[PDB]
């Protein structure tokens, strides 16, 4: 099933070589996302074939708007646990808390993210992420990710898992 | 609803305005209005055709619905009012305001209305230079600029900064980059507020603001944010601009627009979560989960406007690194002090706060919490919370247009005073999004069509640069003509750029 709502556009992050060298030899992210319309920020459209799935793409979406995430080793894994009150609640601290582990402490970054399980009765979730700090001299420059929204944020849970999150850049 | 029962709710009010009434979105207190001349009309009902068009999933609320919802919030007095820059946000509409009664016990504040870039703003600079002693050295003057100025995603200041400086900048505002030389006391007493927020509380910065601001407070950030060198080319009133210091055509001005960084976004973040949480509690009706609010007088409405007041701290001691590092540059490529430069301060003016202001409300003096989400105050004449050079001109307005057109200089007029409690914008507004920017523009067309112009330009990521095109903003004189025709804004100084830097 085509899952996306547009045609593909792929954001080009003027690799450099070396780059272009580290990208080559590890395999390539199965991307489930796109980047949609919302007049002054951007709207994350993310699906997979599970709740799971939808939420993972949605945080590599995240990701995948600050740099060419192809570009990140896999050095380093990381944990993220988080909770909320319903499914859109347990979305906006997933994306929360990834976001926390890129901006502070360590600066992490995830070339992949798993989502291990979403508990739905309580509504927590398990993740986790693969990659290596973040740094200017080894990852291009996308666009800073300021915080997540609900602004027309969506989580449809049916039989094609996706999702719509609005973030603020 | 189609498109057509829409528009059974839309009234033009005059040739600059129009009114949303009642009934538009639930629970509506108060009416909405938009100021829009013939231009940007199609701009905002286009948005509200095409926002959500299908039947089936996806979409996002056009800016007319948010400003409906955020006339729906507890409190608001008089009208939700949209600015000439008005376009969808996440909460409130960018360009959108609302004024609550702080004697009335139902009154909210909504932490995620106000923005996640609490207090960003957009500070003018003059220079004694004239465009003719920058050509000669000009694309030596971006790169000084953009060697000086960390921009972009993973930038980090470069004056070292620890906890205990990060505490006191929370605190003192404008007085710690004075204190620590990196401003001059003239650029605080051309600033709003005079860059400093009493009432800020470090107490109610989480550490994870504190952490994610740390490393950023010295950086310009991304997106919107720029640092401009630009030149006067028209001066519409030339009384506002001799006390502004803009003598001549020609003349060299520079405009700096950046804000709280992380830590405004997670202060922002953390007072959205404890909303959420409080509603639980006291059980306010919205009709968008991004404007969960508590009443102003809650331990979370007075936590948050604390935490946001030292978020504003902060944003203005960035913009002092910001003019620190901008004179450095202009000092090295021209071998003179910043000084002998002229390099002065001429105003400092924020959007995305919250304020506690007097307005008279029906013949009758009230103390209102003011939201303005990408609108800024333009206070008239005679207004006690404006410095003195200004009292008789009335407080400078800065829009800036884009990279490759235009951005003017205003002064906040009674009637703005009057009609939108002195609101104004700080720019023109995005006309495309950023993915629609994409399908109609290519990068390497953007960037000659900047250099057949003789404008200057480094960027951190040079093949996105057509997200923020020209092309995909307002016509910026459209803007400033509305708030100019509408009198929320008088016109008195038009600037073009001639290098710009971004991230
Ligand atoms: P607010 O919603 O923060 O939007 C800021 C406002 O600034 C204007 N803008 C965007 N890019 C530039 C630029 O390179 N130079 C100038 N002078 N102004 C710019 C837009 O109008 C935007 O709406
Ligand atoms: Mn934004
Ligand atoms: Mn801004």
Same mark, same amino acid.
């Given at each position: ?13 003027? +690799?450099? !070589? ?5 990208? =080559? ?5 199965? &991307?489930?996302?796109?980047? *949609? ?57 997933? +994306?929360? !808390? ?5 901006? =502070? ?5 995830? &070339?992949?993210?798993?989502? *291990? ?53 | ?503």
């Amino acid at each position: 099933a085509v899952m996306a709502q547009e045609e593909e556009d792929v954001r080009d992050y003027n +690799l450099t !070589e070396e780059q272009k060298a580290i990208k =080559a030899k590890y395999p390539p992210v199965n &991307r489930k996302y796109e980047y *949609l319309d919302h007049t002054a920020d951007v709207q994350l459209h993310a699906w997979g074939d599970t709740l799971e799935e939808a939420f993972e793409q949605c945080a590599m979406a995240m990701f995948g708007y600050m740099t060419d995430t192809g570009t990140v080793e896999p050095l380093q894994t990381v944990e993220v646990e988080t909770q909320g009150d319903d499914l859109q609640s347990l979305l906006f601290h997933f +994306l929360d !808390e990834w976001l926390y582990k890129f901006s =502070a402490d360590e600066f992490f970054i995830p &070339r992949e993210v798993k989502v *291990l399980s979403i508990d739905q009765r309580n509504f927590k979730l398990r993740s986790i992420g693969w990659g290596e700090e973040f740094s200017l001299s080894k990852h291009p420059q996308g666009t800073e990710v300021k915080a997540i929204t609900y602004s027309a944020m969506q989580v449809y849970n049916e039989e094609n898992p996706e999702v719509f999150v609005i973030i603020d850049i | 609803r189609s498109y057509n029962d829409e528009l059974q709710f839309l009234e033009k009010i005059n040739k600059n305005c129009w009114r949303i009434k009642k009934g538009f979105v639930p629970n509506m207190q108060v009416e909405g209005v938009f100021y829009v001349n013939d231009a940007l009309e199609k701009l905002m009902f286009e948005e509200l055709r095409n926002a959500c068009r299908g039947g089936g999933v996806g979409g996002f609320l056009p800016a007319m619905k948010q400003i409906g919802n955020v006339a729906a919030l507890p409190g608001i007095v008089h009208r939700s009012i949209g600015l000439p820059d008005v376009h969808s946000g996440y909460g409130f509409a960018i360009g959108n305001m609302a004024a609550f009664d702080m004697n009335d016990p139902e009154a909210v504040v909504s932490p995620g209305g106000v923005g996640f870039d609490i207090n960003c703003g957009v500070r003018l600079l003059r220079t004694n230079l004239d465009e003719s002693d920058v050509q000669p050295v000009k694309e030596q003057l971006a790169q000084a600029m953009f060697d000086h100025i960390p921009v972009g995603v993973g930038s980090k200041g470069v004056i070292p900064m620890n906890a205990k400086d990060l505490e006191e900048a929370l605190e003192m505002g404008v007085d710690w980059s004075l204190r620590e030389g990196y401003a001059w006391a003239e650029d605080k007493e051309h600033c709003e507020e005079y860059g400093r927020m009493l009432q800020a509380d470090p107490n109610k910065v989480s550490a994870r603001a504190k952490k994610r601001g740390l490393p950023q407070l010295g950086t310009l950030g991304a997106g919107n944010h720029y640092a401009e060198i630009q030149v006067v080319d028209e001066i519409f009133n030339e009384y506002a601009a001799k006390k502004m210091g803009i003598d001549h055509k020609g003349q060299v001005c520079v405009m700096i627009h950046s804000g709280s960084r992380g830590l405004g976004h997670q202060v922002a973040t953390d007072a959205l979560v404890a909303m959420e949480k409080a509603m639980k509690r006291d059980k306010i009706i919205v009709n968008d989960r991004q404007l969960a609010c508590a009443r102003i007088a809650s331990p979370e409405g007075q936590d948050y406007l604390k935490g946001m007041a030292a978020a504003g701290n902060y944003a203005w001691v960035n913009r002092s690194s910001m003019t620190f590092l901008t004179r450095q540059a202009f000092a090295k490529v021209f071998n003179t002090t910043p000084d002998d430069l002229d390099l002065h301060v001429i105003y400092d003016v924020s959007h995305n706060i919250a304020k506690v202001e007097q307005h008279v409300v029906d013949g009758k003096e009230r103390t209102l919490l003011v939201h303005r989400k990408g609108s800024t105050r333009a206070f008239p004449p005679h207004h006690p919370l404006i410095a003195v050079d200004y009292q008789l001109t009335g407080q400078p307005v800065l829009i800036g247009g884009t990279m490759g057109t235009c951005s003017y200089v205003l002064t906040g007029t009674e009637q703005g005073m009057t009609e939108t409690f002195g609101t104004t914008c700080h720019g023109a507004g995005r006309a495309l999004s950023r993915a629609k920017s994409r399908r109609n523009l290519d990068f390497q067309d953007v960037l000659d069509k900047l250099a057949d112009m003789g404008i200057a330009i480094r960027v951190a990521s040079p093949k996105l640069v057509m997200e923020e095109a020209p092309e995909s903003y307002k016509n910026v004189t459209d803007v400033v003509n509305t708030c100019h025709d509408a009198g929320i804004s008088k016109k008195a100084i038009k600037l073009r750029p001639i290098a710009v830097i971004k991230g």
